[PDB]
Write an enzyme that holds these catalytic residues in place. Structure first.
Site, PDB file in Angstrom:
ATOM      1  N   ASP B 314     -17.746  50.228 -17.706  1.00  0.00           N
ATOM      2  CA  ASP B 314     -16.926  51.184 -16.934  1.00  0.00           C
ATOM      3  C   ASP B 314     -15.785  50.445 -16.226  1.00  0.00           C
ATOM      4  OD1 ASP B 314     -15.801  53.452 -15.363  1.00  0.00           O
ATOM      5  OD2 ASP B 314     -17.714  54.322 -15.124  1.00  0.00           O
ATOM      6  N   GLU B 350     -14.458  50.668 -21.569  1.00  0.00           N
ATOM      7  CA  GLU B 350     -13.835  51.894 -21.080  1.00  0.00           C
ATOM      8  C   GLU B 350     -12.417  51.531 -20.667  1.00  0.00           C
ATOM      9  OE1 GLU B 350     -13.343  53.052 -17.285  1.00  0.00           O
ATOM     10  OE2 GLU B 350     -11.674  53.912 -18.362  1.00  0.00           O
ATOM     11  N   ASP B 403     -17.759  62.492 -17.652  1.00  0.00           N
ATOM     12  CA  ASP B 403     -16.685  62.857 -16.702  1.00  0.00           C
ATOM     13  C   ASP B 403     -15.841  64.095 -17.090  1.00  0.00           C
ATOM     14  OD1 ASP B 403     -17.248  60.809 -14.858  1.00  0.00           O
ATOM     15  OD2 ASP B 403     -16.166  59.335 -16.054  1.00  0.00           O
TER      16      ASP B 403
HETATM   17  C1  LIG Z   1     -16.915  55.267 -14.403  1.00  0.00           C
HETATM   18  O1  LIG Z   1     -16.977  54.787 -13.062  1.00  0.00           O
HETATM   19  C2  LIG Z   1     -16.731  55.685 -11.981  1.00  0.00           C
HETATM   20  C3  LIG Z   1     -16.998  54.849 -10.749  1.00  0.00           C
HETATM   21  O2  LIG Z   1     -16.952  55.591  -9.547  1.00  0.00           O
HETATM   22  C4  LIG Z   1     -17.633  56.908 -12.112  1.00  0.00           C
HETATM   23  O3  LIG Z   1     -17.312  57.813 -11.062  1.00  0.00           O
HETATM   24  C5  LIG Z   1     -18.326  58.758 -10.715  1.00  0.00           C
HETATM   25  O4  LIG Z   1     -19.237  58.356  -9.700  1.00  0.00           O
HETATM   26  C6  LIG Z   1     -18.644  58.126  -8.411  1.00  0.00           C
HETATM   27  C7  LIG Z   1     -19.773  57.730  -7.497  1.00  0.00           C
HETATM   28  O5  LIG Z   1     -20.405  56.546  -7.915  1.00  0.00           O
HETATM   29  C8  LIG Z   1     -17.915  59.371  -7.909  1.00  0.00           C
HETATM   30  O6  LIG Z   1     -17.193  58.991  -6.741  1.00  0.00           O
HETATM   31  C9  LIG Z   1     -17.111  60.043  -5.757  1.00  0.00           C
HETATM   32  O7  LIG Z   1     -18.292  60.099  -4.965  1.00  0.00           O
HETATM   33  C10 LIG Z   1     -18.476  58.931  -4.157  1.00  0.00           C
HETATM   34  C11 LIG Z   1     -19.883  58.995  -3.611  1.00  0.00           C
HETATM   35  O8  LIG Z   1     -20.821  59.446  -4.589  1.00  0.00           O
HETATM   36  C12 LIG Z   1     -17.376  58.900  -3.103  1.00  0.00           C
HETATM   37  O9  LIG Z   1     -17.571  57.784  -2.228  1.00  0.00           O
HETATM   38  C13 LIG Z   1     -17.524  58.146  -0.825  1.00  0.00           C
HETATM   39  O10 LIG Z   1     -18.658  58.929  -0.434  1.00  0.00           O
HETATM   40  C14 LIG Z   1     -19.880  58.182  -0.317  1.00  0.00           C
HETATM   41  C15 LIG Z   1     -20.994  59.179  -0.106  1.00  0.00           C
HETATM   42  O11 LIG Z   1     -21.970  59.067  -1.129  1.00  0.00           O
HETATM   43  C16 LIG Z   1     -19.736  57.163   0.807  1.00  0.00           C
HETATM   44  O12 LIG Z   1     -20.967  56.469   0.991  1.00  0.00           O
HETATM   45  C17 LIG Z   1     -18.630  56.191   0.423  1.00  0.00           C
HETATM   46  O13 LIG Z   1     -18.420  55.252   1.472  1.00  0.00           O
HETATM   47  C18 LIG Z   1     -17.328  56.932   0.111  1.00  0.00           C
HETATM   48  O14 LIG Z   1     -16.389  56.030  -0.467  1.00  0.00           O
HETATM   49  C19 LIG Z   1     -16.038  58.780  -3.828  1.00  0.00           C
HETATM   50  O15 LIG Z   1     -14.972  58.845  -2.892  1.00  0.00           O
HETATM   51  C20 LIG Z   1     -15.864  59.878  -4.880  1.00  0.00           C
HETATM   52  O16 LIG Z   1     -14.742  59.594  -5.720  1.00  0.00           O
HETATM   53  C21 LIG Z   1     -16.958  59.924  -8.961  1.00  0.00           C
HETATM   54  O17 LIG Z   1     -16.482  61.204  -8.552  1.00  0.00           O
HETATM   55  C22 LIG Z   1     -17.645  60.057 -10.310  1.00  0.00           C
HETATM   56  O18 LIG Z   1     -16.684  60.400 -11.292  1.00  0.00           O
HETATM   57  C23 LIG Z   1     -17.422  57.548 -13.485  1.00  0.00           C
HETATM   58  O19 LIG Z   1     -18.277  58.674 -13.670  1.00  0.00           O
HETATM   59  C24 LIG Z   1     -17.689  56.545 -14.595  1.00  0.00           C
HETATM   60  O20 LIG Z   1     -17.340  57.084 -15.865  1.00  0.00           O
HETATM   61  O1  LIG Z   2     -14.146  58.449 -13.688  1.00  0.00           O
HETATM   62  C1  LIG Z   2     -13.146  58.804 -14.618  1.00  0.00           C
HETATM   63  C2  LIG Z   2     -12.305  57.626 -15.063  1.00  0.00           C
HETATM   64  O2  LIG Z   2     -11.138  57.595 -14.224  1.00  0.00           O
HETATM   65  C3  LIG Z   2     -10.137  56.700 -14.712  1.00  0.00           C
HETATM   66  O3  LIG Z   2      -9.626  57.070 -16.025  1.00  0.00           O
HETATM   67  C4  LIG Z   2      -9.188  58.429 -16.156  1.00  0.00           C
HETATM   68  C5  LIG Z   2      -7.730  58.546 -15.710  1.00  0.00           C
HETATM   69  O4  LIG Z   2      -7.592  58.234 -14.327  1.00  0.00           O
HETATM   70  C6  LIG Z   2      -7.187  59.946 -15.982  1.00  0.00           C
HETATM   71  O5  LIG Z   2      -5.807  60.005 -15.637  1.00  0.00           O
HETATM   72  C7  LIG Z   2      -7.393  60.341 -17.452  1.00  0.00           C
HETATM   73  O6  LIG Z   2      -6.466  59.595 -18.290  1.00  0.00           O
HETATM   74  C8  LIG Z   2      -6.100  60.134 -19.567  1.00  0.00           C
HETATM   75  C9  LIG Z   2      -4.875  61.039 -19.445  1.00  0.00           C
HETATM   76  O7  LIG Z   2      -5.222  62.245 -18.770  1.00  0.00           O
HETATM   77  C10 LIG Z   2      -4.292  61.359 -20.818  1.00  0.00           C
HETATM   78  O8  LIG Z   2      -3.129  62.168 -20.711  1.00  0.00           O
HETATM   79  C11 LIG Z   2      -3.955  60.063 -21.535  1.00  0.00           C
HETATM   80  O9  LIG Z   2      -3.387  60.332 -22.782  1.00  0.00           O
HETATM   81  O10 LIG Z   2      -5.161  59.332 -21.705  1.00  0.00           O
HETATM   82  C12 LIG Z   2      -5.816  58.942 -20.485  1.00  0.00           C
HETATM   83  C13 LIG Z   2      -7.071  58.228 -20.909  1.00  0.00           C
HETATM   84  O11 LIG Z   2      -6.775  56.936 -21.420  1.00  0.00           O
HETATM   85  O12 LIG Z   2      -8.778  60.197 -17.791  1.00  0.00           O
HETATM   86  C14 LIG Z   2      -9.300  58.864 -17.617  1.00  0.00           C
HETATM   87  C15 LIG Z   2     -10.709  58.850 -18.191  1.00  0.00           C
HETATM   88  O13 LIG Z   2     -11.597  59.831 -17.648  1.00  0.00           O
HETATM   89  C16 LIG Z   2     -10.691  55.274 -14.709  1.00  0.00           C
HETATM   90  O14 LIG Z   2      -9.764  54.360 -15.280  1.00  0.00           O
HETATM   91  C17 LIG Z   2     -11.999  55.198 -15.486  1.00  0.00           C
HETATM   92  O15 LIG Z   2     -12.519  53.881 -15.336  1.00  0.00           O
HETATM   93  C18 LIG Z   2     -12.995  56.263 -15.028  1.00  0.00           C
HETATM   94  O16 LIG Z   2     -14.131  56.289 -15.892  1.00  0.00           O
END
Ligand SMILES: *[C@@H]1O[C@H](CO)[C@@H](O[C@H]2O[C@H](CO)[C@@H](O[C@H]3O[C@H](CO)[C@@H](O[C@H]4O[C@H](CO)[C@@H](O)[C@H](O)[C@H]4O)[C@H](O)[C@H]3O)[C@H](O)[C@H]2O)[C@H](O)[C@H]1O
Ligand SMILES: OC[C@H]1O[C@H](O[C@H]2[C@H](O)[C@@H](O)[C@@H](O[C@H]3[C@H](O)[C@@H](O)[C@H](O)O[C@@H]3CO)O[C@@H]2CO)[C@H](O)[C@@H](O)[C@@H]1O
Ligand SMILES: C[C@H]1O[C@H](O[C@H]2[C@H](O)[C@@H](O)[C@@H](O[C@H]3[C@H](O)[C@@H](O)[C@@H](O)O[C@@H]3CO)O[C@@H]2CO)[C@H](O)[C@@H](O)[C@@H]1N[C@H]1C=C(CO)[C@@H](O[C@H]2O[C@H](CO)[C@@H](O[C@H]3O[C@H](CO)[C@@H](O[C@H]4O[C@H](CO)[C@@H](O)[C@H](O)[C@H]4O)[C@H](O)[C@H]3O)[C@H](O)[C@H]2O)[C@H](O)[C@H]1O
Lengths: 517, 506
Positions: B314, B350, B403
């Site tokens: 990731d 990723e 996601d």
């Molecule tokens: C690839 O990686 C990303 C890495 O984040 C994956 O993202 C998912 O999971 C994240 C959580 O691990 C989500 O982030 C959101 O939720 C967090 C908490 O779960 C938020 O963090 C904030 O809130 C927590 C409360 O739990 C506090 O303790 C922290 O201090 C505070 O920062 C964060 O802001 C928010 O963005 C994310 O939405 C998910 O998409 C992804 O899925 C992988 O593919």
């Molecule tokens: O947690 C979700 C991932 O978030 C990050 O990657 C996201 C981008 O931030 C988001 O803008 C989107 O990018 C795509 C874009 O919408 C599309 O037009 C373009 O052609 O391709 C992009 C993808 O390469 O979606 C991605 C993936 O969900 C972050 O970098 C990643 O690590 C997280 O998993």
């Protein structure tokens, strides 16, 4: 280094696509197929209108067949010379623009739905000769360019031999050079001098005709370049026995002491013939060619460089291994595979001419050495959609097995048209094809296959003009292993490049969709 | 020799396809999504039934999300530890097979259309503890395996720290380890000894629970292997602040003298949020990690090897450059260290988002495949890299990931310009089966691997979406509906197999 800050706008440091990777498409159309009044297509107005049409589609490549003087059946692949141009492609109307004919001298139009070489020759050749005669008799700018052309060493290394061969052939009533008297057969110097005296005018006219071909071909090529169109030529692997190439370079072919071929060319039993294709050309003595760093082949490529942006290498497998049939045989199926020159040939070409853009026709029996040879020189190969529906899902002609460095065809000049092919297609294969392809009406099967070629990952997609016109089996250019009735197709006299905007728009839509504009 | 005859067999000297180029497909399905009576999916019978189902389709890959203990929202990407297993995935029925529970101790079934972690914890944890207690109290063969597991140095290099952290966290009423008294905060030796004496039982139970996870996970993995199925795991590039990983390896993160971060993680304004995703994890002190040949990262990969055949990384871009709320990442130096320490690895980058030249070069230099996601393919022009005609062989094509919405959900809200585009490129029958149209497009790709979320095979809508990025509530809960059994998906299996056959992925 690691941990430290980046410069600002790091976010704009994005990958830039390589311009040499640019996706594109093109059309396969031999200039003999252009419509017009003189019995054959030519390098005049229709070539320029075709280029304009092609440009309007978004296509950026035009592929032609070999431009050599063809055999008497019309075949570009058993040419009378490896380097000369087919002079019946010369445009009489372009000669009028050059001051070498007047409008009043042009013949009355003849209807010729297909090319008849004997009819076109009778019509055009007297006027081509008359134009060449005016050129050699004149004393200005065009004459000066004739002299530069003929004194240029990369012309004279093949053109002198070609003109002497033709002059001797004009002097003698003989089947082939095998029957020629010894001093002419074996190019004795005083014999060649005698020929120069007795055939001086013929020789000067033959050379003038090659200049006129060169001149007109180069105008077409520059016009294509001005309109964003690259031209892909074709380098036939073999030349005919009765040619200056074989006669002037005997030691480099597999001939006996008397100059008769021991072995001739072809392929064993295949798709097109259960006895094989007996092409019957002489074969290269590759070890002897190695002794003068393949200079004959090098000269060939140097000539191709001058005519074309890129060049297909016909029967590319033949440089790894070639089928050799005894010369007396009536079928190709008795024969032996023999070892080709391999990379040693392409190293010699590189050293002599530098950077080249080559396309391997890697169709046929593809053994391991063939693949490795192609990869070792970095050349793209071919996929042909008409072959994709035999066997299983590992068939290399299926889209999901295509490669980027490759050229995809719906079919080549050797295949039926898509409609023709669809019409005779085996039911097992047809049911397969329906699953892979997006088919609307059977009328538009050619467009379904065209779309599949354009959707490929292959960098280049090439479609025969017959398929863009949605034509049937009667428009097939060539049927392999047949001796008669090939190479004649012409665009129907009613179809102008002005009447093909629908087709242009439809191609452009598909190119836009599949990122080939 | 040039000119000579070839041997007789020359015409049969045909190219043999390279086995490492073999085209394949798979399914993305986290084990929490399995049906069952204990409020959450587990590593018991449904995992084996899923493997059998997956095998019958011709698929040869199963992708999971990280198996770490998740945050309290259920997120596998803000785990409580980088190496431990999520103990709520332990099957109670499998503990009964092992002699550690009796059938009569099992709880009454609860209906839970979706996973509630608090409900699953209250139900399962007392029995998992009771099972762990019987394990540590026993003599015999299973106890002997517990001891081998815990004395194995490639376990103890992370598990000891994880158990001590958890014990101290159990001992203390505190927000995070930042608030812990100095000797515990900073791992004074006599403090850790004191914790061992005063929390001995908790520590032994925590370790026993990790053994039971390992045991059950490894049976699932060996069964998958027997059925021709590789397992692809996942890891976030970052771990949460409140973890043994940070607390026990302070010198390797960007913390001040008092152990507080200073710099946290994230990436700028994107598709999912016009203010960006502010992840807020601590960041790696990469230069310090270089000083002991990246051993923490090496240990992590070694652990991923133990759990998975292959592993997605990731936010792979973060190894070339990372956003600190841009700084230079460790680059190939890290992967060289991994190679030297662990040997051959199968990693998937990723590489999604706006990515820079160094990211592409880094990915290519280690030979790792990147991603294409079909849901992203219909914005912009024909140069969009997610379009099939722009796919690469060394790549993994998804219809979508955890996601993204489901295909049906996505189709349902799709912008008209994008929808009209998609209709030209895709082969669509009924809109009901839009997920199958996109699945066919993934399978027809030149990309070597195609992965489809289970939700799309089931043709499900937006309510089955696993996660919405940048939202804090209502994620990670999806379960296969209680009515849908793997026994009842033969039509779906046959349809997948027909497509895999057609596109040479069997
Ligand atoms: C690839 O990686 C990303 C890495 O984040 C994956 O993202 C998912 O999971 C994240 C959580 O691990 C989500 O982030 C959101 O939720 C967090 C908490 O779960 C938020 O963090 C904030 O809130 C927590 C409360 O739990 C506090 O303790 C922290 O201090 C505070 O920062 C964060 O802001 C928010 O963005 C994310 O939405 C998910 O998409 C992804 O899925 C992988 O593919
Ligand atoms: O947690 C979700 C991932 O978030 C990050 O990657 C996201 C981008 O931030 C988001 O803008 C989107 O990018 C795509 C874009 O919408 C599309 O037009 C373009 O052609 O391709 C992009 C993808 O390469 O979606 C991605 C993936 O969900 C972050 O970098 C990643 O690590 C997280 O998993
Ligand atoms: C035509 C191509 O053949 C080979 O590849 C085939 C292959 O054999 C097929 O099996 C098939 O393979 C596919 C499989 O079917 C499929 O299942 C899957 O696996 O994919 C496979 C593809 O990889 O299809 C391929 C491709 O079509 C070759 O390997 C290939 O290179 C070749 N194409 C080019 C090569 C040549 C040769 O130069 C061209 O040949 C053409 O020109 C020949 C010479 O003119 C001609 O020969 C005929 O005509 C001659 C006269 O011109 C005649 O000569 C006799 O008669 C004369 C007077 O009439 C006299 O003067 C002579 O002395 C006499 O010998 C010949 O007898 C006669 O055979 C060819 O017919 C013609 O095709 C191609 O055009 C190139 O494109």
């Amino acid at each position: 280094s690691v941990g430290e800050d980046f410069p600002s706008e790091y976010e704009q440091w994005l990958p830039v696509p390589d311009p040499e990777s640019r996706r594109r498409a093109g059309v396969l159309l031999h200039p003999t197929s252009f419509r017009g009044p003189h019995g054959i297509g030519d390098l005049g107005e229709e070539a320029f209108r075709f280029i304009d049409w092609l440009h309007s589609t978004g296509c950026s490549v035009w592929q032609v067949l070999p431009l050599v003087p063809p055999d008497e059946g019309g075949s570009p692949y058993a040419g009378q010379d490896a380097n000369c141009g087919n002079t019946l492609l010369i445009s009489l109307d372009e000669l009028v623009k050059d001051g070498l004919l007047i409008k009043d001298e042009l013949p009355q139009p003849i209807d010729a739905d297909s090319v008849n070489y004997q009819t076109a020759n009778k019509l055009k050749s007297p006027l081509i000769t008359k134009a060449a005669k005016r050129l050699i008799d004149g004393n200005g700018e065009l004459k000066s360019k004739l002299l530069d052309f003929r004194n240029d060493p990369s012309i004279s290394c093949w053109l002198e031999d070609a003109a002497y061969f033709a002059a001797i052939d004009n002097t003698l009533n003989a089947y082939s050079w095998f029957e020629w008297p010894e001093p002419l057969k074996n190019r004795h110097l005083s014999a060649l001098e005698a020929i120069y005296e007795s055939q001086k005018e013929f020789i000067d006219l033959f050379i003038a005709k090659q200049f006129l071909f060169q001149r007109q071909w180069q105008k077409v090529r520059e016009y294509a370049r001005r309109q964003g169109v690259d031209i892909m030529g074709d380098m036939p692997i073999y030349v005919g026995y009765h040619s200056a190439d074989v006669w002037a370079n005997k030691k480099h072919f597999l001939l006996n002491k008397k100059g008769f071929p021991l072995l001739v060319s072809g392929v064993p039993p295949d798709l097109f013939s259960e006895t094989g294709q007996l092409w019957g050309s002489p074969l290269y003595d590759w070890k002897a060619m190695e002794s003068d760093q393949y200079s004959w082949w090098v000269n060939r490529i140097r000539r191709a460089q001058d005519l074309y942006d890129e060049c297909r290498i016909d029967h590319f497998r033949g440089f790894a291994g070639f089928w050799a049939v005894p010369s007396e045989a009536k079928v190709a199926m008795v024969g032996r595979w023999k070892v080709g020159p391999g990379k040693s040939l392409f190293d010699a070409i590189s050293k002599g001419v530098g950077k080249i853009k080559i396309i391997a026709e890697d169709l046929g029996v593809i053994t391991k050495d063939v693949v490795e040879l192609r990869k070792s020189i970095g050349a793209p190969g071919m996929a042909v959609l008409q072959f994709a529906f035999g066997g299983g899902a590992d068939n290399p002609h299926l889209p999901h097995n295509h490669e980027v460095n490759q050229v995809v065809y719906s079919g080549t000049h050797d295949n039926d048209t898509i409609r023709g092919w669809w019409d005779t297609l085996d039911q097992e294969e047809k049911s397969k094809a329906m699953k892979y392809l997006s088919i609307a009406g059977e009328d538009d099967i050619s467009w379904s296959v065209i779309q599949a070629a354009f959707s490929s990952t292959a960098q280049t997609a090439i479609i025969p003009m017959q398929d863009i016109l949605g034509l049937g089996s009667s428009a097939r250019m060539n049927t392999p292993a047949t001796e008669v009735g090939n190479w004649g197709w012409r665009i129907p006299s009613s179809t102008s490049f002005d009447n093909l905007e629908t087709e242009s728009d439809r191609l452009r839509d598909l190119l836009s969709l599949y990122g080939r504009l």
